Write a protein that binds this ligand. Structure first.
Ligand SMILES: Oc1cccc(-c2ccccc2)c1O
Ligand SMILES: Oc1cccc(-c2ccccc2)c1O
Ligand SMILES: Oc1cccc(-c2ccccc2)c1O
Ligand SMILES: Oc1cccc(-c2ccccc2)c1O
Ligand SMILES: Oc1cccc(-c2ccccc2)c1O
Ligand SMILES: Oc1cccc(-c2ccccc2)c1O
Ligand SMILES: [Fe+2]
Ligand SMILES: [Fe+2]
Ligand SMILES: [Fe+2]
Ligand SMILES: [Fe+2]
Ligand SMILES: [Fe+2]
Ligand SMILES: [Fe+2]
Lengths: 288, 288, 288, 288, 288, 288
């Protein structure tokens, strides 16, 4: 099974806007380029987020990490047994992604996924944020999370759990209208309360948002002011009912895709219990 | 196997007396109603104790929790293999209990049991006690415990251990007369020393008492005075030989059913050793 | 100023009853005799409590400790400046008390006080309780406390504070009748919330009670049962409003003198604030 | 497999000498009698050591504990599969030992062993030592250890490891003469470095010594002086090479059987490594 | 599988130079001799490094430790199943090495390996360094590590992982020339980030270096000055990218074999993730 | 006032015996020589103990340390005010002692004392013991203590307390005969329970012993065996009543002067209370 989410690649219409957004606002470190993709770092990894020009203005792919070569072969075995098509990344792709091996596939609804192992690290070029942020929480919990929009949650759940090995943490019925709600399913594959959430939202994007977790509450408070100065805030500060992450949301330069910047959630372990919530926030998160 | 005791439902002759008892005396939070049942909270769960009008003046049902949907199906499998009759709760029942799924059955002596998963939580309506209590110890250990009266302890033991997966912690020979004692069996299904105790007591109730655990010794001391002002104390403060819970007992408004309010017991783990005790109290607990 | 209360001497009508009481019930260690006085230990000191035959059935004297020879001379100076009569204990008395020096005086109402330094310790004869008690809290806080009955609290306060250097911690208005209360003044001379309390009670004894503090809550719980078996309990368990000591009271063999056996109070330091309380117990302590 | 050593029974020629030895010298608590056996406690168990009159002047039996009824049946299964004869203790024996069930057998060289579960505890009669000792280290590690004398170490090893489930910790070549040593094998069945050691010593006793572990270094220091006053010291203080227990040895009233009284050893876990030592002491333990 | 690296034996042209090097410079304790081999200690083991005269000027053998006799037989089984030739060490060899049993074999490229259990410890002769070093980090992590030079890394990897049970931690592409690098593979068999690294270096030695880990940073700083006074420094202080060991390198008296003396690395556990690095040092380690 | 004891100088008949004693037995580090004095280290100081040839076979001088130049002038002022003769050490003496300034005087009974400030430290030559000892406890508590023999304790007390600023910790009545004891006075000048003890012993030496404190209990245990192998033990292990130091005594090569090697005492602070003890040992210390 997948151990963690390791990287995200976006294809966007305004690369310079995304560059400024990820560095000056979010605080990531510019890390050069690979082909036509600009690279950004959040820690010791050579890169965590890639941005390339494209009309999609959406997530182009997500990198799903396993711990070793044997693990990758076991994932290939699971894909075969499940009847899910995949192709082994060639040398050129391996060099582009800076990984020792990868399998290329798509989830049931067209999102390209890359399962890999052996990512490149560059401790000789220590991480230096582009904006005031003490650091990000990554490590064994991966880069963060994202909310995957799907037309059929049941179908998506079977794939992510039965094929990829994610596990359901909980469900929140997100109110959409006076008498309409969407049952968002939050999935984990490590200690991070969720790495992927599945939701049947009526937005035309592959994802609703991606999330990064900072080391301190001040990191979040300061980031809010930066994104507010940029005119991008979409929610006030708040704390989630399920993971207890204290965060705020803001627009990325790609319409209808947001970023969530948070701190201090609960983590999960083998004794986790599935529960249901009627609200996304215990407090705050008022839409603006 | 059952992971923890999650809820209790009582059917009583004096609903207002029970309402005052659970709130003003015990300290639970009033949490509205579901049908003809008044609901009470002890933590983030939508409800923990339900009270409905009825001539029983007894425990009407107990909710036994598992961690996920797959776990519930495994319990259904165990019930089938054991020849124990059960029915799947319908949508109406699921909505009434605020759970994602449940199996309805009875123990060998008529106590209705409900095995469920996916309970509702309401962190947006933080718990607020109705009386001075810093909080209750629940979480992975569930709501508390209860002593189940049975006519045949051996038969009850086989069901709770072999079918439901509870495990014997220890036995206390509770003296009843000059030369008569009842071997009470204390069972765990998690870290709580016991969640259910089995005893062949000569009382006409399904249970002898239910127990709630508070966060501090002062919580217990203060609760004693509240219940004493209500004229309900049945024991002085004391500490148990087996779980080392420091508690007192008091009458509920239903004749012959007591409540135990305690603090600071030992917890169990895989290295627990079965032992036998000749007394229920290491000190205190004098009957009054 | 006085550093701590170090010893107590009682003159009683039933020495054997007191012997059994202090050892089998309270848990002190029998430590031989000095003249016609039986000696009892609570720690490394050669003795802490002395019991001698006498019709008083009361506290005969209290030993007030200072840290060195120079300190004792300074106390002699304070007594002289205050016009309080005193005599230096002779060699025989010094040997009897096992101290390097002492001043003999009385408080304004006839209670003999002995200010001393250099007490004897016997670490080669380690303390062994006569009943199950993990140990007592003494050290820099001394042996415990006692409530001194006085006819004139103002006069007593001036002596204990201005002459001996005790400091007021707080006051409790102890209800005596429907519209009658006694303002008990609690005084400290170290970290122990109080070492001496002053109160105008209508009892014919020099003191209302003496108090010993044990290391654990179980120590207290077990002691309660022992004293209850002896038929001596005067209060249920409870916790004080001012020092937060969790204790119970019981009769000593001397009529109208009680013992208090407690655990876990707050301690004081230079930042202590004088306050007033309307009750002696935050919870419990019901009279029996 | 055996979880821990729970009790020892001795048959001796001088019961009063053993009584004084275990209480006044070692510090155990006298705990009445069961038949012609005097009982002694070291903790919450109803008894840990039994002494009965007999010409053996040796260990009469050792109680080997398992955690539950199912565990005991599994041990019966292992004995059957191994061809080791055993008899189930009858009701009278169960009542005598204060256990819920037991299997009676002998090791390959005649030492009676009793495998049991469900021992009686008496927390309402808290442990009170007969001599100054803060307490003993028992719990999951059992009462202590003993060195079993055997004529054939290989044969003894196969039985204790293959049948009873003990595991080798290490070996010490104990020098007997100028060019003669005995390879003592130290075996564990829990965190205690060893519960039983096997050695081909030329003494006519079933065991060389039994060992008790106290809570503090002072406990050991004080016990040394007590046993020295009794004229029983056989070694000066010292510390073992293998378990790092700091102890001393002394004669019991039974010729050639010693007691070891120690503190502060290392404990073992799954990552333990078998090693060999050429000396029993890292320092001290000079024979006297 | 192998649990840890326990000992190293060198065959050298200048025994006196090696003796001075290991004692006065590195700080090991001289521990006598066994045959024509001089012995050196780093902890409680009778020996850790052996030096004997020989033209090789290289590592003569490496001792690979397992936890018990059964483990050794399992390793013999693995060797048989893998078709790897081995011989059981005879009594003379066992006595020479001070072990309870061993298997003698070679890795695919001629390095003699000895798999053993039951090493001798001498706690009665406590370790005393020959130079100022607070101590070495050994224990469950073994003596240290070494970099094994191999002509075929793939072949070496299959043997060390598939046969001996080592596990890949990570890979570093060590730059050799302007457009030439060697993929060094770092392998663990316990918490030590690596115990053996495999690299296709163009040096004529079996190993590139061996490494010892000291308790403090000062240990390393002081050792640097000692080796610098001896004219042996080959690198400045630095910290590795993969294990985060802070160290320096120096020449041993055998040409082209170095020693690494370090402190403070990260350790590994079951959740370790394979990664790739482009540099050996996060900082420092400049060649001199 | 004196801050701590910093150094000791001995004049002895057998320098080689003392050299072996201090290094191979006690564990001090040989530190060259200054004139005809051999120097020994216990920590970062250039020297702590000096040994020179002389018929005295006794302590020749003791170095008493203050924190700065101003402090030394204040001590000169106190000596003048007290009428105690002293001479300022000249440049040659300052260079010999490796100090920035010193005052030379004698105590009332002829022991030369040197009050100094600014001692030399040599961190570039880190301490390396000559025998297995993890280290000594020095720092702000100085090198250790010594027992000063005096003919008139009262006179000695006035000088050490009134002139030098030492403070009485406690008194022990050391039994000399059936009805004879000597009141030993233990004095502190920092956290070390005592730095100098005064006693009217009938020995012809300036001191009874000097004491060094090691970091661990094993340090003490190992040192005992070393001194026992040398045939120098004068007491078994034991623990003192007053400072709770766990130690043993041994003869130095100078007749009637002993060394005490200990661990783990209590320390003193401003809240220390003067007490009296009837024994030097709580346990152990039997004379041999
Ligand atoms: O991390 C999270 C935890 C809980 C809910 C959301 C969420 C809120 C609104 C829309 C979609 C998801 C979330 O992002
Ligand atoms: O929690 C508990 C632990 C031990 C005994 C009891 C008990 C006491 C009297 C009657 C029934 C049970 C109990 O409630
Ligand atoms: O320690 C104490 C703290 C507060 C009140 C009392 C007290 C209660 C009743 C009568 C007299 C004193 C006391 O003893
Ligand atoms: O606990 C122990 C640990 C190591 C050795 C012994 C031992 C010493 C002498 C004779 C027999 C055993 C021991 O008792
Ligand atoms: O411990 C280590 C960790 C990482 C790299 C090296 C290394 C550096 C240069 C040449 C060979 C190995 C190493 O020794
Ligand atoms: O450190 C110490 C603490 C207490 C007593 C002594 C002592 C014992 C015998 C003779 C002289 C002194 C001592 O050395
Ligand atoms: Fe989110
Ligand atoms: Fe209960
Ligand atoms: Fe009181
Ligand atoms: Fe032993
Ligand atoms: Fe290395
Ligand atoms: Fe001393």
């Amino acid at each position: 099974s997948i151990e963690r989410l390791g990287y995200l690649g976006f294809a966007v219409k305004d690369v310079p806007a995304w560059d400024h957004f990820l560095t000056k606002s979010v605080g990531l470190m510019a890390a050069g380029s690979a082909g036509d993709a600009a690279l950004y770092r959040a820690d010791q990894r050579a890169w965590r987020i890639a941005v390339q020009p494209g009309e999609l203005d959406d997530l182009a792919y997500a990198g799903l990490e396993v711990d070793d070569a044997a693990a990758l072969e076991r994932m290939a075995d699971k894909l075969r047994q499940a009847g899910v098509a995949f192709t082994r990344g060639d040398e050129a792709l391996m060099q582009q992604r800076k990984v020792m091996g990868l399998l290329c596939l798509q989830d049931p609804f067209g999102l390209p996924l890359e399962i890999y192992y052996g990512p490149a690290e560059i401790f000789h070029e220590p991480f230096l944020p582009s904006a005031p942020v003490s650091g990000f929480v990554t490590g064994d919990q991966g880069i963060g999370h994202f909310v995957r929009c799907v037309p059929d949650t049941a179908k998506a759940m079977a794939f992510y759990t039965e094929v990829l090995g994610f596990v359901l943490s909980d469900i929140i019925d997100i109110q959409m209208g006076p008498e309409t709600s969407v049952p968002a399913h939050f999935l984990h594959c490590n200690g991070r309360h969720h790495t992927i959430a599945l939701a049947a939202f009526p937005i035309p994007k592959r994802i609703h948002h991606f999330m990064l977790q900072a080391n301190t509450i001040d990191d979040v408070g300061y980031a809010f002011d930066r994104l507010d100065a940029a005119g991008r805030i979409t929610s006030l500060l708040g704390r989630h009912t399920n993971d207890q992450t204290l965060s705020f949301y803001a627009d990325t330069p790609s319409p209808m895709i947001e970023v969530e910047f948070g701190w201090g959630p609960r983590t999960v372990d083998s004794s986790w219990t599935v529960a249901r919530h009627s609200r996304t926030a215990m407090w705050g998160h008022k839409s603006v």
